[PDB]
Design a protein around this ligand. Sequence first.
Ligand code: FES
Ligand code: FES
Lengths: 104, 104
Amino acid sequence: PEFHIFICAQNRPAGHPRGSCGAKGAEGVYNAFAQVLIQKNLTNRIALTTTGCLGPCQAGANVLIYPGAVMYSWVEPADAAIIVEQHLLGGEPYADKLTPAEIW
Amino acid sequence: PEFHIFICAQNRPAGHPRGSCGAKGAEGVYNAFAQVLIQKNLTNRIALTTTGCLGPCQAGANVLIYPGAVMYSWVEPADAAIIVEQHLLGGEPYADKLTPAEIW
Ligand code: FES
Ligand code: FES
């Protein structure tokens, strides 16, 4: 792996006070990433893995990338290509969805 | 996080042809790490997270460490402290349980 994409997929019961990335659209986000990776022939260069809780649940859905420990928050399906294209390939973190520096 | 410890926790049904790190003692491995981390006051420095399948199921229980993409295979509870101390604190990957280079 040149890159490792970690998608928080922790579920908690509906109405849990922490919420959960699972309830915030992790499944749609994972699929957007995988669709992008398959499309661009990247599935042998970039690993895509679900995780439990990554810590900042209220900023979900959360995505962490290694190398770098770069986290993204409030992630939506449309960002998957943006992150792959501009950060992973282009070398520039997508500042619009970077987890705030105070939180991570 | 200085280090991120990823513990494959994928379960598959009993008798699944792939097996699962779940069936290979992932939970015993995760608990050993957690106990070493809490005991050495490292839970703010080193993140510990469960993951879906990391790929090489036949070599499980599998742990991956970032920075570095260093995977350990056939992991047992006793290795936790070894990896934390030798590798994560001491800088020397623990040669005895490193995932064969062919595989990862
Ligand atoms: S549930 Fe996703 S970061 Fe906590
Ligand atoms: S189930 Fe753990 S590596 Fe596949």
